[PDB]
Amino acid sequence: SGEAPNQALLRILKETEFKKIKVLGSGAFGTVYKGLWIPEGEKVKIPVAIKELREATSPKANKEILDEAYVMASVDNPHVCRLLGICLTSTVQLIMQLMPFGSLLDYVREHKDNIGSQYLLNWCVQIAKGMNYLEDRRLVHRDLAARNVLVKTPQHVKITDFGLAKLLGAAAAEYHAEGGKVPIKWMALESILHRIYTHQSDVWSYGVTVWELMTFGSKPYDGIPASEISSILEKGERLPQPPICTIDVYMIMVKCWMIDADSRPKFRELIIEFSKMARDPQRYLVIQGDEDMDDVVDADEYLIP
């Protein structure tokens, strides 16, 4: 088979037509604001998160942030984050849909007390749906983790952070990264030793991400140096069974951690198996006692021409 053309549109916004309101976070990436976007002459107000780079004079950053805008402009799926546009000011800044509840990792940590088994299973499904879409687009995330899942509503989550994502080239099956900084606790063994990333690499990361949710935001391999992580997997060890997981749920994430990538599950299969569990959540997770804004429009209703 061959590759089809990518007719995704990239919209360039003016600095005048959106207003920053408050700071959500700050760091090396720059600053991320909460704001409103008002397309000129369209009579809509779209709540947005705006991110501008910290330093204007950073040539590597601008090349790397435009790479993220390229990836996000090419994806349209209910469970993958939505890019609204970019602004080419002195400090380049891109505009994304606002996810009012922050990252899913912080959410389960802040609400560990009363999260039901149905939410956890539905989240597993929705994340699998996003990842199956990226596989259909020949896109490899390479950074799937609970911290990189944003929450629109408690019943609707989305995948984000494509700073490391790569589009698998035509008639290519692996990426073969040259090198760089990476999150080791979420990486498949083949990626650790050989810098090889595939769609089955992301399935491994999916297994760890599920493990973060089932443990209510616990840190994987806590206390262990990342240096010694590789030798641990080679000797056959994995992450322990979360106390709320039945054997049925734990069996699936273990399959995500087999060294032969070809024998690991595929996102299309993970959807089905978690969809089946979501029909009766309490059979598969045993949790103690689980039983002017007039013209505002959500970004998921503001479709581009």
Ligand X SMILES: COc1cc(N2CCC(N)CC2)ccc1Nc1ncc(C(=O)OC(C)C)c(-c2cn(C)c3ccccc23)n1
Interface residue with ligand X, options 96, 131, 168, 299 (CB under 6 A): 96
Does 253 contact ligand X by CB under 6 A? no
Total of residues contacting ligand X (CB under 6 A): 14
143 included as an active-site residue? yes
Q: Find residue 22's DSSP bridge partners.
A: 34
Q: How far is CA 281 from CA 20, 198, 285, 291, in A?
A: 41, 31, 6, 10
Residues 43-82 that bind ligand X (CB under 6 A): 49, 51, 81
- Are 248 and 284 in contact, with CB atoms under 8 Å apart? yes
Q: What are phi and psi of 71, to 5 degrees?
A: -65, -50
Minimum CB–partner distance for residue 107 and ligand X (Å)? 10
Q: Which is nearer to ligand X, 105 or 168 (CB)?
A: 105
Tokens of 142: 């390479």
Among 3, 54, 102, 232, binds ligand X (CB under 6 A): 102
In sequence order, what are the beta bridge partners of 46?
37
CB nearer ligand X, residue 144 or residue 150: 150
Amino acid residing at 120? L
DSSP state of 296: B
Site for ligand X contains 160 (CB under 6 A): yes
Q: Catalytic pick from 143, 161, 260, 294?
A: 143
Q: Which of 46, 84, 86, 99 binds ligand X (CB under 6 A)?
A: 99
Distances (CA, A) of 91 to 9, 12, 73: 22, 14, 20
Select the residue interacting with ligand X from 65, 98, 124, 149 (CB under 6 A).
98
Considering the complex, what minimum distance in angstroms separates the CB of residue 51 from ligand X?
Answer: 4
Residue showing tokens 């990836």 = 71
Q: Is 270 in the site for ligand X (CB under 6 A)?
A: no
Closest CA to 250 of 209, 210, 199: 210
Q: Which amino acid is at 64?
A: E
Q: Given the rule CB under 6 A, which residues bind ligand X? A: 24-25, 32, 34, 49, 51, 81, 96, 98-100, 102, 150, 160
Active site residues: 143
